[PDB]
Amino acid sequence: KAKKMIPIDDDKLIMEFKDDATAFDGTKKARFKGKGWLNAQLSVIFFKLLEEHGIKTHFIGVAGGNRLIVEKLDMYPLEVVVRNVVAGSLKKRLPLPEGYELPEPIVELYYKNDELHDPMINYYHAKVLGISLDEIKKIEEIALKVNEILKDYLAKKGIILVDFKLEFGKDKNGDIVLADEISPDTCRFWDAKTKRSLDKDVFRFDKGDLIEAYKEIYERITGEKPEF
Amino acid sequence: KAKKMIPIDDDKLIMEFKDDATAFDGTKKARFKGKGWLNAQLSVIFFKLLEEHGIKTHFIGVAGGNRLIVEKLDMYPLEVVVRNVVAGSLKKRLPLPEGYELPEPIVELYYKNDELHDPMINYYHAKVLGISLDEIKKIEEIALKVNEILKDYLAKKGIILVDFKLEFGKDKNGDIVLADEISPDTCRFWDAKTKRSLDKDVFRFDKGDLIEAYKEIYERITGEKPEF
Numbered sequence: 293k294a295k296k297m298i299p300i301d302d303d304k305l306i307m308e309f310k311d312d313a314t315a316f317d318g319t320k321k322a323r324f325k326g327k328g329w330l331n332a333q334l335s336v337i338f339f340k341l342l343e344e345h346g347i348k349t350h351f352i353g354v355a356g357g358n359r360l361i362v363e364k365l366d367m368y369p370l371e372v373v374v375r376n377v378v379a380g381s382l383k384k385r386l387p388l389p390e391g392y393e394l395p396e397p398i399v400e401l402y403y404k405n406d407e408l409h410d411p412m413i414n415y416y417h418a419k420v421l422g423i424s425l426d427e428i429k430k431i432e433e434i435a436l437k438v439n440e441i442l443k444d445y446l447a448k449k450g451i452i453l454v455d456f457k458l459e460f461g462k463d464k465n466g467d468i469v470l471a472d473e474i475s476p477d478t479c480r481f482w483d484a485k486t487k488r489s490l491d492k493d494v495f496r497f498d499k500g501d502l503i504e505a506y507k508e509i510y511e512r513i514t515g516e517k518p519e520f
Numbered sequence: 521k522a523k524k525m526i527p528i529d530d531d532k533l534i535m536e537f538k539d540d541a542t543a544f545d546g547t548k549k550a551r552f553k554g555k556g557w558l559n560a561q562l563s564v565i566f567f568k569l570l571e572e573h574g575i576k577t578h579f580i581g582v583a584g585g586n587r588l589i590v591e592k593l594d595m596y597p598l599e600v601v602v603r604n605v606v607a608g609s610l611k612k613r614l615p616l617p618e619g620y621e622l623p624e625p626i627v628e629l630y631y632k633n634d635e636l637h638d639p640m641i642n643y644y645h646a647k648v649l650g651i652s653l654d655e656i657k658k659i660e661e662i663a664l665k666v667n668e669i670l671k672d673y674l675a676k677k678g679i680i681l682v683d684f685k686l687e688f689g690k691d692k693n694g695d696i697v698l699a700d701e702i703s704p705d706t707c708r709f710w711d712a713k714t715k716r717s718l719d720k721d722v723f724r725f726d727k728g729d730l731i732e733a734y735k736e737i738y739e740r741i742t743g744e745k746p747e748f
């Protein structure tokens with residue numbers, strides 16, 4: 293839908309970032325020239341940042357612009373959502389307004405299943421899904437640590453980290469390893485002063501130019517205008 | 521919707537069981553003569569059974585047919601669902617068929633909120649709702665114990681306990697006390713041999729005569745035909 297996975301061998305594969313974007317369970321579609329490049333490059337910076345902090349990620353190296361070399365993992369069938377500020381689907385689950393500052397981070401577990409439209413699950417559903425309580429606890433522990441690292445990093449750059457989605461897999465040693473991507477597609481980012489979205493919500497809710505919004509994030513983090 | 525709550529004093533109130541039944545977030549409505557009486561009487565038997573087993577319930581005594589004397593509690597805004605067999609909403613959350621025997625009980629937490637249509641929550645939402653992790657853990661621990669007591673009791677009477685909903689409150693000592701009702705309205709009950717519903721699903725999905733189904737449960741448990 294937004295990425296291709298290309299085999300290399302048993303140990304590694306290629307994650308390719310496409311210009312394609314979707315929303316509303318794949319029902320909204322557009323292409324944005326440069327979006328693959330931006331998301332690829334922002335994922336690299338985030339993976340490298342988190343690695344420095346002791347977070348095991350699938351990130352191995354770059355394979356030219358839009359393609360990353362990543363470790364092969366047994367993927368957990370989860371989307372793991374961390375929420376600091378109330379936005380999107382949390383508005384329908386809690387009677388709190390968009391922009392409400394949570395007293396502590398909220399972690400949500402979603403089962404990756406297209407047929408069931410990615411329903412929310414708890415630790416018990418997880419277990420029936422074959423994911424042990426100890427696996428779940430260390431998945432959440434990692435997500436909360438990632439949260440602290442990303443929110444501090446971004447607050448320096450005048451960016452509020454509202455929420456974001458993570459995915460994980462096990463490597464050959466049975467270690468839990470951070471996977472997929474971290475990009476303006478899979479996070480909400482607000483400008484600290486204006487509270488404007490610099491993320492996929494621009495596309496989701498037609499708030500302006502998606503590529504300008506993504507370029508802003510890139511420029512704020514790197515201090516440079518994008519090469520494409 | 522199905523019950524009235526009538527004050528007595530600071531310590532206690534009246535729970536009255538009405539003939540009214542609803543389904544599909546209150547959109548389906550009917551009255552069933554005798555349903556209040558059946559649900560009242562079955563709640564009594566269940567509360568008395570669980571009390572014997574060390575479960576603190578709000579049950580104090582009977583006030584004539586359809587009305588129970590119950591303890592006043594600070595109610596948790598939760599519906600706590602325990603699931604042994606796949607049925608109802610769990611079919612949309614897990615790709616398992618109706619009638620699938622779970623490898624262990626599933627506990628689900630729902631936030632009681634009419635505006636939000638009782639959305640599922642996890643421990644983190646609970647906390648933002650003002651419910652501590654320790655409160656949640658002992659709420660679930662009680663629900664799982666209630667489950668074991670009810671499923672064994674009912675298996676003797678040729679009834680499979682598929683799932684059921686519980687509600688809870690704190691008494692003046694800050695003890696967590698089982699509340700609301702336990703009736704064929706708030707449980708799924710299948711016949712052990714035929715797998716037929718003897719519960720509110722009869723009404724929900726027009727499967728036959730609701731009152732016959734409820735009378736069956738009553739007769740199986742008490743060994744007697746209902747006085748009304």
Ligand SMILES: O=c1ccn([C@@H]2O[C@H](COP(=O)(O)OP(=O)(O)O)[C@@H](O)[C@H]2O)c(=O)[nH]1
Pocket residue numbers: 386387388389390635
């Ligand atoms: O479903 C709801 C209900 C309320 N609120 C919040 O809590 C306040 C409660 O006030 P009310 O529901 O009367 O709405 P208002 O009149 O403030 O718009 C609102 O301003 C909202 O910020 C919310 O976020 N979601």
Ligand SMILES: O=c1ccn([C@@H]2O[C@H](COP(=O)(O)OP(=O)(O)O)[C@@H](O)[C@H]2O)c(=O)[nH]1
Pocket residue numbers: 407614615616617618
């Ligand atoms: O959304 C789903 C998908 C599958 N299944 C179960 O897993 C089996 C998988 O087979 P399939 O999805 O091909 O359906 P079938 O062809 O068996 O009806 C089914 O029989 C169902 O019991 C389910 O319960 N829910």
Ligand SMILES: O=c1ccn([C@@H]2O[C@H](COP(=O)(O)O)[C@@H](O)[C@H]2O)c(=O)[nH]1
Pocket residue numbers: 371373379380381382410455456457477478479480492
């Ligand atoms: O399939 C999804 C669903 C959500 N999210 C991200 O997770 C957060 C919470 O999403 P929502 O549950 O509010 O839609 C947002 O940052 C959103 O972009 C994803 O990356 N992929």
Ligand SMILES: O=c1ccn([C@@H]2O[C@H](COP(=O)(O)O)[C@@H](O)[C@H]2O)c(=O)[nH]1
Pocket residue numbers: 599601607608609610638683684685705706707708720
């Ligand atoms: O508002 C509700 C919702 C569900 N249940 C009960 O909880 C179980 C699971 O319900 P569902 O989530 O499958 O609808 C069933 O026994 C159902 O009767 C209730 O008592 N009240």
